[PDB]
């Protein structure tokens, strides 16, 4: 038996830890990702891999919704995309969003 709701994040990345000796969380594999993709469930996969494993507004506002009793998410965009985008921008690469 083991579970976790809100513990510590890993140093290298803001993801839940694993195992029992340290209070981690269950590991979501990529085949589980494919299965989620197999179902039409879209929001579930996004939030699971994003807020249940990051965005400051997403997790804070989720705390506000849940404590308020609301069950709803502003998906927004998880800043890691911005990290990659500006890393590429540092390189001589004109990569950008579009309309």
């Amino acid at each position: 038996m083991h579970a976790r709701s809100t513990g510590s994040y890993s140093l290298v990345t803001q993801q839940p830890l694993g195992g029992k000796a340290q209070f981690g969380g269950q590991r979501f594999g990529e085949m589980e990702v494919w299965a989620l993709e197999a179902y039409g469930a879209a929001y579930t996969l996004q939030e699971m891999l994003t807020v249940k494993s990051d965005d400051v507004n997403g997790r804070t506002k989720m705390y506000k919704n849940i404590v308020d009793g609301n069950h709803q998410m502003e998906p927004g965009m998880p800043e890691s995309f911005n990290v990659l985008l500006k890393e590429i921008r540092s390189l001589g690469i004109n990569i950008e969003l579009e309309d």
Partner: peptide, 10 residues
Amino acid sequence: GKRVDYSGRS
């Protein structure tokens, strides 16, 4: 494949 909070196992 990451790890997920609010997750359990048994």
